[PDB]
């Protein structure tokens, strides 16, 4: 509907709850150093003003744009120059430039102390006694630490956090219930943040064409019944939405997503049969629902790709008159028939086909030259499939924890220069990827692995390039995204590496380990295993196994011993000397 007041407009569309939550997020992301109660006050002022406008749109300042009003509120902050320095100078600018000014002065890494997780009982009491304040303080705390995380997506995590507390605080064992859930949500939060940045970094580092190629592949998988023309229309729209979201303006990004959501829901008949329930959903949820929609089933009578792309005599002619449209159609056709492939695999095939057409269409006899291009696809398809069966079989033999340890040893041996915390975190996450994706049937394993492997390898690459230690990791991280995982898969053992000198404190343990959680204990042991491998990198899988066995016995025994701490000391020096002798 037409509206005199934009803020009254947004308010009625979102509802009061979502509005108040998003305003809090927006303020926390722009003013990261201001305390909670000042933010609560601002939220309440903006919210009370919104409701003035809902009641009377002819009221003072209700006609103003939400950008103008938002900037106006920031500029009423007293300590703005004293706290944010030159951000105060934004206030001397007219509104087109002012929001741009403010947006540039967001601090990606604010110097804020790590957010500590309270005990389960204190959280549950806080949740019980003061639900609104509990949940909003933390929304504030997370938003100010993540100024670029898309606010509506953060709102969606907050609701799952709320759900976890509702269930687990009434449980018999609260901590056994709650802490796994909070660990999952944190992982998904770190993953969502990873993807968002990775989209923008891909788009800038590699450009639209490659971005669109990725999108063609994925949308053809999701929507195999759609005609190429429609897919291409969605890709073009999807590419522009990303472009404007990567600039970081919330309203712009939200409006764009909701336009694309609106388009897709009006054209369900031309896109997918799986959009129905998504398209009934309210504003913020609809775009989010559509992003996570499941693959539609493929049409029945699908011709072979050979006809248009190998056997036609007009392959070169059709290619030459529009190369990207032709390659787009190739990718569209291949992808829609193969939801079981990774997008990157599909892009490798499309790039192979491109390379082949480029040379073969310049040969005296093209039709001959390019007649067996589909043979080049066999190894490309094989390579990821092999690793899947190979890792998921090993996962089934060992279980998550020991699978993780198998990885620790493998990757420490390959890149021993990486810091111990990084190797532990990456190997654990890689372990979970196996734990999650290996449970799927074959058809679903490769897309699963690609998605989760993408965020884990992003997190590694992000960590690494802030503190570089290995050129080989650098090369894998700075390569094309299509080649990133194969580059990492190709890393060999570093036979050059000179062992880390012995540090007795690293391999001394204490009685505290017995009472720690399964998670925390595993981490202390995994830390030690990395260091063991770094100190003895020529140790055989079987030699380490013997040390790992003796260590298990050491823990088990000293955790039943009366005097725990002298056990750990006395037996500990024994295990260490024996191990040193063993691994010589
Ligand atoms: C989107 C966030 C909304 C509210 C979140 C409430 C959760 C608070 C408990 C976790 C605090 C420490 C962070 C963590 O390790 O999980
Ligand atoms: C520890 C806070 C977890 C909150 C999860 C919601 C999404 C926020 C983005 C990523 C949060 C954790 C990032 C970090 O470890 O610094
Ligand atoms: C290039 C600066 C504007 C950033 C645009 C925001 C959208 C991307 C969200 C990424 C959040 C993670 C933070 C980071 O990795 O820098
Ligand atoms: C709604 C987003 C779908 C279209 C994605 C655009 C192409 C960018 C691909 C590069 C980033 C990969 C991250 C991921 O696996 O999600
Ligand atoms: C950086 C490599 C990205 C993948 C390259 C695949 C090449 C074949 C696809 C050509 C681009 C199609 C773009 C489109 O029409 O949407
Ligand atoms: C884009 C810069 C200013 C953003 C903050 C404006 C103040 C209201 C925020 C909440 C309402 C809009 C949220 C949305 O539609 O996604
Ligand atoms: C696979 C179907 C595509 C439809 C998704 C529409 C939403 C556009 C994505 C824009 C990304 C903004 C950042 C984010 O929400 O993570
Ligand atoms: C580290 C164990 C993860 C569990 C699954 C193994 C993944 C191996 C295949 C990787 C495929 C990703 C997509 C691709 O590069 O084509
Ligand atoms: C510091 C750790 C770097 C090494 C870990 C990255 C490698 C994981 C990607 C591939 C995992 C499944 C297939 C494979 O292991 O080749
Ligand atoms: C050569 C230096 C002395 C080594 C002392 C033993 C430390 C290695 C134990 C860590 C691995 C145990 C993990 C497990 O399988 O539970
Ligand atoms: Co309207
Ligand atoms: Co009660
Ligand atoms: Co625009
Ligand atoms: Co080198």
Numbering used by the authors: 1 to 584
Task: Tell me, in the authors' exact words, what the paper reports.
HSA is the most abundant protein in plasma (ca. 600–700 μM) and is the main carrier for Co2+ when present in the circulation. HSA is also capable of binding non-esterified fatty acids (NEFAs),15 hormones and drugs, as well as a variety of other metal ions, including Zn2+, Ca2+, Cd2+, Cu2+, Mg2+, Mn2+ and Ni2+.16,17 Based on spectroscopic studies and affinity measurements, three Co2+-binding sites have been proposed to exist in HSA and other mammalian albumins: (1) the amino terminal Cu- and Ni-binding (ATCUN) motif (also called the N-terminal binding site or NTS). HSA and ESA are composed of 585 and 583 amino acids, respectively, and share 76.1% sequence identity. In general, the structures of ESA and HSA are highly similar; both are composed of three homologous domains that form a “heart” shape, have 17 conserved disulfide bonds and possess a single free thiol group at Cys34.19,35,36 We also unequivocally identify the major Co2+-binding sites on HSA using site-directed mutagenesis and examine the effects of NEFA binding (palmitate) on Co2+-binding to both wild-type HSA and mutated HSA forms.
To maximise the reliability of our findings, the structures from four crystals of HSA with bound myristate soaked in 9–16 mM CoCl2 solutions at resolutions of 2.4–3.3 Å were determined (data accessible via molstack; see Section 2.4). The crystals of HSA in complex with Co2+ belong to the C2 space group, while the ESA crystal structure presented belongs to the P61 space group. For the HSA structures the strength of the anomalous peaks ranged from 3.5 to 18.4 RMSD. The only cobalt-bound side-chain common to all four structures is His9, proposed to be a ligand in site B. Residues from adjacent protein chains, which could potentially influence binding in the crystal are also indicated. NEFA-binding facilitates a significant domain I-domain II movement, leading to a rearrangement of site A; His67 moves approximately 7.8 Å away relative to its initial position with the sidechain of Asp249 moving in the same direction. However, Asp255 in the HSA structures presented is too far away to engage in Co2+ binding even in an outer-sphere mode (>6 Å away), likely a consequence of the conformational differences between NEFA-free and NEFA-loaded albumin. The different conformations observed in the HSA structures, where the relative positions of His67 and Asp249 vary, are likely to influence the affinity of Co2+-binding at this site. However, in each case it appears that these residues would be close enough to enable Co2+ coordination. The position of the Glu252 sidechain is altered in the NEFA-bound HSA structures. Furthermore, addition of 5 molar equivalents of the non-esterified fatty acid palmitate (C16:0) reduced the Co2+-binding affinity at both sites A and B. The presence of bound myristate (C14:0) in the HSA crystal structures provided insight into the fatty acid-mediated structural changes that diminish the affinity of the protein toward Co2+.
